[PDB]
Design a protein around this nucleic acid. Structure first.
Ligand code: CL
Ligand code: NA
Ligand code: NA
Length: 315
DNA sequence: CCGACAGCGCATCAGC
DNA sequence: GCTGATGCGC
DNA sequence: GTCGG
């Protein structure tokens, strides 16, 4: 319907983030791309799209040019620009953001081949991102996510049977494919020691986790792989306090639109919900002490809301 | 006219 | 060495 | 870039 428009907006978003380093213009184009993607009609004019929330004057003007010419003069020029397209491309490497990409291009490093010739100028993360460049851009079929889940849950239980692990993200919402695996971890002995390390070690022991990007006491980011050769996959593991676990599960399950709506409804009932806690609000608007949470449904019960299955949390 | 737009965990950089 | 800023991913 | 105080 409007693929030509949403592609254009997506491309504009990328160049704003990676070349212009204007993160809010990036999110503005993405927000516009998303709302247009769910618009059940073929857009005939910028004025029509202007009615949608997130689409303003400038984008409406760009849609008019696109619908009349089939292209964008601004986009065409940016594409033909060697510097801008090189900067934009290098950010596809995990660990290379707008700043690093600009740094590399400024000194003649513009291609993936150039990066491989200059390993001494890359940090650990960037080297790993370079090593699995192709694999990291591949989607993860749900069936593979299921196998990965079985391994995570099994090994976690072997370290300590009192651990609780939950694979969130779009996967928990029942998506047919995922971009990565986000695991939320907790334990009754950890509330608001060295628990994350023991779990990472075990997954390394059975050779599920193959590489480490970042690792601390509460968050692990690394690379994993199913036993055969399957592509290497990005995996994150977060260690969350027990009294904050299910608020975390709710938060990282999403979606973003769903969370925004649930937070809105919560406020109308006299509660405030963030990533960590759900708090009651006083008459003056003062937030009280964290309320006890033992399940996802408890959060729904506090705000007098019908429990939404993760499969129906797209909005 | 003009500020909000999410912000935390970790690695790395800038400066003392 | 330290503390705080910046970069990055999600 | 868009929205809203
Ligand atoms: Cl911006
Ligand atoms: Na609009
Ligand atoms: Na990147």
């Amino acid at each position: 319907l409007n693929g030509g428009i949403t592609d254009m907006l997506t491309e504009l978003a990328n160049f704003e983030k990676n070349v212009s380093q204007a993160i809010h213009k990036y999110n503005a184009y993405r927000k516009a791309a998303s709302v247009i993607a769910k618009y059940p009609h073929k857009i005939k004019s910028g004025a029509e799209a202007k009615k949608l929330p997130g689409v303003g004057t400038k984008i409406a003007e760009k849609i008019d040019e696109f619908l009349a010419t089939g292209k964008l003069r601004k986009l065409e020029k940016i594409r033909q620009d060697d510097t801008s397209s090189s900067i934009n491309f290098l950010t596809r490497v995990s660990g290379i953001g707008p700043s690093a990409a600009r740094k590399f291009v400024d000194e003649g490093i513009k291609t993936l081949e150039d990066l491989r010739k200059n390993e001494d100028k890359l940090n650990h993360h960037q080297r790993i991102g370079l090593k699995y460049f192709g694999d990291f851009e591949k989607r993860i079929p749900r069936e593979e996510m299921l196998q990965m889940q079985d391994i995570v849950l099994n090994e976690v239980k072997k370290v300590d049977s009192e651990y609780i692990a939950t694979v969130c993200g779009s996967f928990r919402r029942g998506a047919e494919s995922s971009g990565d695996m986000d695991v939320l971890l907790t334990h009754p002995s950890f509330t608001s020691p060295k628990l994350l390390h023991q779990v990472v070690e075990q997954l390394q022991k059975v050779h599920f986790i193959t590489d480490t990007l970042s690792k601390g006491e509460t968050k692990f980011m690394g690379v994993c792989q199913l036993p055969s050769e399957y592509p290497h996959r990005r995996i994150d593991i977060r260690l969350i306090p027990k009294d904050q676990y299910y608020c975390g599960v709710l938060y990282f399950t999403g979606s973003d639109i769903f969370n925004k709506n649930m937070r809105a409804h919560a406020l109308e009932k006299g509660f405030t919900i963030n990533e960590y806690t759900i708090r009651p609000l006083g008459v003056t608007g003062v937030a009280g002490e964290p309320l006890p949470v033992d399940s996802e449904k408890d959060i729904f019960d506090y705000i007098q809301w019908k429990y939404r299955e993760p499969k129906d949390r797209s909005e």
